[PDB]
Design a protein around this nucleic acid. Structure first.
Ligand SMILES: [K+]
Ligand SMILES: [K+]
Ligand SMILES: [Mg+2]
Ligand SMILES: [Mg+2]
Ligand SMILES: [Mg+2]
Ligand SMILES: [Mg+2]
Ligand SMILES: [Mg+2]
Ligand SMILES: [Mg+2]
Length: 52
RNA sequence: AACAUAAUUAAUUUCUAGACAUCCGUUUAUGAGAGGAGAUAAGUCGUAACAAGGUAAGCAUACUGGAAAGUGUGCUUGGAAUAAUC
């Protein structure tokens, strides 16, 4: 899922709300939280920030 | 070369990339040298034209000649024969 979101931001393409939802749901470790925090930041600064 | 993401406010992205390459040509200038016209203006050689200009003049064309010109063939009068009679 991380790869899918990374490609979209590189191409300046919108990311789905379902995509960020799947990431947060499948957090399995303390380290994963840190990565999700970065992607929540990226989602906020993206065209579909309102759809969180 | 023209799709793809996204969508419980709605929008993002694509909507391109080479080859502007020299032409075939066309004008004008330069002019080795070879000519033409015109004028300058005292000559030189003849005397061709103007008188029937001393071979009437001229046109076309051909040939010929220092030069004007000469000669042939056809044509012109822009020559003449001012004009009663064996
Ligand atoms: K003569
Ligand atoms: K004459
Ligand atoms: Mg004479
Ligand atoms: Mg004579
Ligand atoms: Mg004469
Ligand atoms: Mg003649
Ligand atoms: Mg002769
Ligand atoms: Mg003779």
């Amino acid at each position: 899922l991380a790869s899918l979101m990374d490609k979209a931001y590189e191409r300046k393409l919108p990311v789905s709300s379902l995509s960020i939802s799947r990431f947060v749901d499948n957090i399995a470790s303390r380290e994963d939280l840190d990565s999700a925090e970065y992607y929540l930041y990226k989602f906020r600064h993206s065209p579909n920030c309102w759809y969180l």
